[PDB]
């Protein structure tokens, strides 16, 4: 889920995820453990997003053609709970 940013000596990269890991256990080293990792970049169009600070001030997502899914208790009782308060 998380995207990571990597800062080497002078070079800064963004949108990376780890893709590998290779531990090693050898008589050459007992105290420590030599490891070799690997990262790959997530490629996306429009690398610089555009953001609005107002939630109402935003565009319109589109959700299409779902089902009413029914499975509901009753008609009168739910309304008599919703307006009478209980």
């Amino acid at each position: 889920d998380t995207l990571y940013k990597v800062i080497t000596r002078g070079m800064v990269f963004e949108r990376m995820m780890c893709t590998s890991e290779a531990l090693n256990q050898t008589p050459d080293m007992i105290s420590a453990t030599p490891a070799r990792l690997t990262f790959s970049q997530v490629l996306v169009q429009n690398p610089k997003p555009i953001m609005f600070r107002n939630a109402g001030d935003s565009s319109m997502i589109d959700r299409g053609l779902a089902l009413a899914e029914d499975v509901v208790g009753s008609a009168g009782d739910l309304f008599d709970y919703a307006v009478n308060g209980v």
Binding site: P27, D28, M29, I30, S31, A32
Partner: protein, 152 residues
């Protein structure tokens, strides 16, 4: 006034099957080094690319060379040790068959014991030099358990 003499050194070597009781070493050759060992190298280091250092552990054995006068009884005993085979006699788990334990005594009084190891190599027959002297036979051991004994 520090005494670093080697006069009076004695060694006892005990085995698991060949010499369950052990024998003694007292006749040390003249031309060769009577006893010596290689450097113990139990640590390592790698250099990071920032510019720093990193130190760790690594495995290290211990090797000893012992020389005797050719024709002595101790040479016969050491040749007996060298002639045995690991594939022979019994087998039981995890003992490095026929452990040889070496107990060395210093003229000063300090004692050291080394275990978990076996003989490694040595001569098979005597050799004659240009001057008509048989050379001093040498034998190499390997030890895995340097028991930290340096007591007075």
């Amino acid at each position: 006034m520090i005494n670093v003499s080697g006069f009076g050194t004695g060694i006892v070597i005990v085995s698991a099957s060949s010499f369950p009781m052990g024998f003694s070493l007292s006749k040390f050759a003249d031309d060769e080094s009577p006893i010596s060992s290689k450097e113990l190298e139990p640590f390592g280091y790698e250099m990071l690319y920032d510019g720093g250092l990193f130190a760790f552990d690594k495995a290290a054995p211990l090797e000893v060379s012992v020389s005797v006068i050719a024709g002595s009884e101790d040479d016969i005993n050491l040749r007996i040790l060298l002639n045995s085979k690991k594939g022979s006699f019994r087998f039981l788990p995890g003992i490095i068959p026929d452990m040889t334990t070496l107990v060395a005594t210093l003229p000063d009084g300090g004692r050291t014991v080394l275990s978990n190891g076996t003989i490694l190599k040595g001569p098979a027959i005597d050799t004659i030099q240009n001057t008509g002297r048989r050379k001093g036979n040498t034998y190499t051991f390997v030890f895995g358990s340097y028991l930290g004994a340096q007591t007075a």
